[model samples]
Every structure is written in structure tokens, then in C-alpha cells.
Target: QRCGSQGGGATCPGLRCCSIWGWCGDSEPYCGRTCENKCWSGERSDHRCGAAVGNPPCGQDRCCSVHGWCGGGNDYCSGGKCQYRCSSS
Candidate 1:
């Protein structure tokens, strides 16, 4: 199922998080040794979405029901809930 917890640690060979979804398109699949996918925090960050995009590529054309917002920013769907994460590295 395209991996859900594998971010920043060890990106699957040949399959890197391209834009939104972390994978090499619908095919090719990702394969790595780590599984710690990080989410977005609505802290006015850049890379991650703050509230949610109108049509985030992450959640697909359905306005990121998981990790994407429409008005604010990064639509996060962590732990089975949609919220904001405002942390930095």
C-alpha cells in the first residue's frame, strides 16, 4: 500500500518522495529499511503544508482529507486525525 511511515530516514531505492505522496508514482513502489514517515505542522513552514491546499496531490483531487487544507495550510492526517503540526528542524 505505498508505505505510510517511511520519511526522511531511508527513502526506498529508485522511489523517492516526489511531490506530495511519498513514492515513485502509482507504480514502481517504495522499499527501504526504515518506517518513520513525518507529517506536516501548520507553523508557516515551507516544505510541508501548513493548512491544506485546495487540491493537494497528497490526498489527491479531494482536498487532502489526510494531509492538506484549503484555506489555512498543510492538511495533516496523523494518528487517524486531521490537525496541525508547527515544529521545525
Candidate 2:
């Protein structure tokens, strides 16, 4: 649960949003307004999927879901609903 310079450093499990306070979580508490890294909140510009981003693709190992959000794994990248950079699509 610790990341972004805390707890000796670590990565998130899902959504992978690391907060400015070096905490790993999925909601605004971790990926909101200002994050340390991997900001995949549903509203973040970098997490805006589908035709929203025009041409820019998601970050490394992330995929654009059909729901117009950025994420990863079979649920987000599978189902052929990924807009870009889908390792499972």
C-alpha cells in the first residue's frame, strides 16, 4: 500500500494510482488532483480513454477501457473493448 517515496518504495496492485503522500490506492485519495505517479483516476486527463484523448495512448502496461477510463488486466483490456495499448485485446 506504500509507494511514491514511502515505505522504501513500492507499486500499486490495481488501478496502480500512487498518491502524493506515497500511498497506493484506486480512488481520489490516491489518484486525485495531484498524484506521485500512475494517475489513472476516472477523471484524470491521462486516464481519459477512447476518442477522448484523440491520439495519445495510455501509459506503460495500461489500457483504454470501453467505459472511457484507463486501466489494465483482462477485465479492462479484454473483451475487445480496449481503445488503445491493450495487451489482451
Candidate 3:
């Protein structure tokens, strides 16, 4: 994530986590080497969702379910167990 922020690390916004000793990004340069394919902690783009280090890809219009799926409507936003909203760009 962001150098040395501890806790949950920095966010990638719209990319994947290239945690090559914590150097992250969308590209596979450091990703394929020693990085783990997790999204950085915080909001993100369409390609960001599922299980990662900290946060998921839930944006302003979308809701994250307890199962970690991002979407709208009842199944996702109805229950009070939703996680977070996607970040506005």
C-alpha cells in the first residue's frame, strides 16, 4: 500500500495490489514477482471487489454484501449487513 501506513495499508483506487514487499499497483511488474493479488484498502473501480487486504470495491452507487459481493437492489442493500459504498470519482 502507501509506503508504511500500517493498520490496513493504502488503497489502490482502481487497481490491484502489487505487494512486492508492500509496493502495490495495477500493473503486473511488481504484482507477478512477489505481490499478492489483493485490492488496496479503500474505495476502488469496477475491477475491484471480493476478498482483499482490507476494503472492497463497493462504490457510491453500490453496496457490499456480507458475502463480499458488490451491487444494488434488495439482495445487496436491503439488509443491514451491507459493508460500504463505492467511492465517487
Candidate 4:
């Protein structure tokens, strides 16, 4: 994952996330592009059921808020807004 995302050459590919980091619990996989945990065959409904990488639609106190889905462990806070579908490679 780190190698694919931070490797120094075009021969590799775009930013990639590997299984070494752990199950995505919410992340999608890109196929034919060097990856593991390939989530290329699941339904969108199943994929969309989990939290995304970004800010929440509600505050920390809400049921599905930024509290548990943000900060250090959650990818949902890094970019400011939630992201569901990733590159369809």
C-alpha cells in the first residue's frame, strides 16, 4: 500500500491502498492496478452502507456523527468531506 502510493515512478500507478493496512470496513478496491482486498464485485448498496472518508453531515453528538467517524483512526476526517466510491481502475 505505502509502496504503491508513494513509490517513485510512473511504472507503478496512482495512489493505492493495500491490505496490510487492514480491512477497509468502508474502503473500495481498485482492480488490475496492483491491490489486495479487491472489492470490485460488491453491490453499491453494500458499499455505501459504511462510513466514508470525510466530514460528517452532522455534529459529534448525532447518531451518525463526526465523533466516532473522525480524528486519528477514521479516514472520514482527513479530507473534510466523505468519499464513497474511489477510482474504478
Candidate 5:
């Protein structure tokens, strides 16, 4: 959740960006090229389900559910909603 959407840079836990490429960082690579709601610098962190885009909120071997939550099961992997299939590797 961001303080607001004017600047629109709310990640999770801290300030960062959930790049279009699905990455968490502070630079352009993680922010974006157009910078259109790409580099959110409000709240962000290494966490997953919250907002940041990475492995999984809880950690490895978890699935990023359609609702952007973290979990493990057919329920989370079903449909095309589950995009980030994290692993321990």
C-alpha cells in the first residue's frame, strides 16, 4: 500500500520497484525504462506476497498465487494466474 498514487511507487516493506520484468531493485533495471508506474519508491522489501516481485513472500519453493499471495498447492498453481513458480535452486 502506498501513501498515495500520485508518484505511485509503493512496493512493500520499503521503497523500491516491481519491474515489468518481475524483479525487485532500486536502479533502472528493476525500476523500468518508461518509468510509468514502474519504479515505485514508497514501500518495498525482500518479502514476496506483500508487494515486491521475486521468489515468494514466505521464501523458496512457494508459488505466487493469482491474488499476489504466496502459497503452495494446486489451488495456487491452478489457472494462468500463478506466474512466479519459486524454487530452492
Candidate 6:
């Protein structure tokens, strides 16, 4: 089901998390977007790894924040914050 303010003020069931798109789940797509109930928690790997050099994301162990920056900090790997690799590895 959907949740969050944009989702009409509903809550997710179980350990699921909400996303900026107003959806709920337990994976990167859900846990890594935006949080209204269960916020993302953990330290991410900073290899500047997500997508590829030609791609728009980071490397394999980093988060792709705005401007395609990479890191393991909150702004770099937090839900609804990073553009890519927003979750842990």
C-alpha cells in the first residue's frame, strides 16, 4: 500500500519504509527515497560506486547525491537524499 503525506496520510505495515514517491516497501526503491515513518539507518560504503562513469549514478559502494557527488554520509546515502546508492551495501 501507499503512505506518507502525499499518499494521503497512511502508514506502512511491518518494517516497511515510505518513499518520496509516496510508496512503501523494504528495499532500496522504498527504503531509499524519502521516509515518513521508518527512516533509513546505516553507514554506506564510499567507493563512489553506484552506476558507471557514463551513467548518472555513483559507483558500487557510494551514493549518488545531487551533482552526482559520492560519499557515505547522510546527505550522501540517506533516503530521499541521494540520487543513487542511497542505501547501504
How many clashing pairs per prediction, in order? 15, 0, 5, 3, 7, 8
Where is model 4 poorest over a 10-residue stretch in terms of lDDT?
A: 56-65
| TM-score of model number 6 | 0.40
Runs in model 4 with CA error above 4 Å? Answer: 2-30, 33-35, 51-78, 83-89
**TM-score of model 5 vs. true structure:** 0.31
Candidate 5, 1-89: lDDT as tens digits: 33223325454333334555444544555444623233423213533453445423332234556577656666555556564443222
Worst 10 residues of 2 by lDDT: 52-61
Residue 5 in model 1: lDDT: 36
Off by over 4 Å in 5: 1-58, 86-89
Candidate 1 lDDT over 3-76, as tens digits, reads 43333434333222232344333222211222123211211233333233422222221112234442223333
When sorted by TM-score, best at the front, the candidate numbers are: 2, 6, 3, 5, 4, 1
* Cand. 1 TM to true fold: 0.17
lDDT against the true structure, each candidate: 0.28, 0.62, 0.48, 0.27, 0.43, 0.55
The deviation in Å at residue 51 for candidate 5 is 5.4
- TM-scores for all predictions: 0.17, 0.45, 0.34, 0.22, 0.31, 0.40
Q: In model 3, which runs have C-alpha deviations exceeding 4 angstroms?
A: 1-52, 86-89
**Model 6, runs deviating above 4 Å:** 42-89
Which is the winner by TM-score between candidate 4 and candidate 6? Answer: 6
lDDT of 6: 0.55
Candidate with best lDDT: 2
Pull out the clashing pairs in model 2. none
Q: Which pairs clash inside model 4?
A: 54-76, 54-81, 54-82
Q: Judge candidate 1 at residue 59 and give its lDDT.
A: 23
